[PDB]
Amino acid sequence: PSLTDMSCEVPACTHSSDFGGVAIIKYAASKKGKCAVHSMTNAVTIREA
Amino acid sequence: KERGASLQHTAPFGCQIATNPVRAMNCAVGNMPISIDIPDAAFTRVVDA
């Protein structure tokens, strides 16, 4: 699957050191399937792989 | 015979006066601070709203 037209917003964030932030990302997928998710900065760790 | 008006009729701030026990009620004077401890279960997450 390939995604386009992506946008990101963060309804809430707390730097609690316990996954205190949640990001909502809108996407247009070319087709059904699975995608890997990775942070491009060490500053932010994402729980979902 | 010479009692005059009672406090429920003369009191400032619209106070109501009653006895047994002696009470001043609903005097519209000053402020009343309130502190509420609200449990985590009472709150809905932003992302769930």
Automatic annotation (TrEMBL), chain B:
Origin: domain of life: Viruses
Protein's cellular compartments: Host Golgi apparatus, Host trans-Golgi network; Host cell membrane; Host cytoplasm; Host endoplasmic reticulum
Subunit: Interacts with spike glycoprotein E1. Processing of the precursor of protein E3/E2 into E2 and E3 results in a heterodimer of the spike glycoproteins E2 and E1. Spike at virion surface are constituted of a trimer of E2-E1 heterodimers. Interacts with 6K protein. Interacts with host MXRA8; this interaction mediates virus entry. The interaction involves 2 adjacent E2-E1 heterodimers.
Protein task: Provides the signal sequence for the translocation of the precursor of protein E3/E2 to the host endoplasmic reticulum. Furin-cleaved E3 remains associated with spike glycoprotein E1 and mediates pH protection of the latter during the transport via the secretory pathway. After virion release from the host cell, the assembly protein E3 is gradually released in the extracellular space.
Name of protein: Structural polyprotein
Organism listed in the record: Chikungunya virus
Shown part of the complete sequence: 1054 to 1102 of 1248
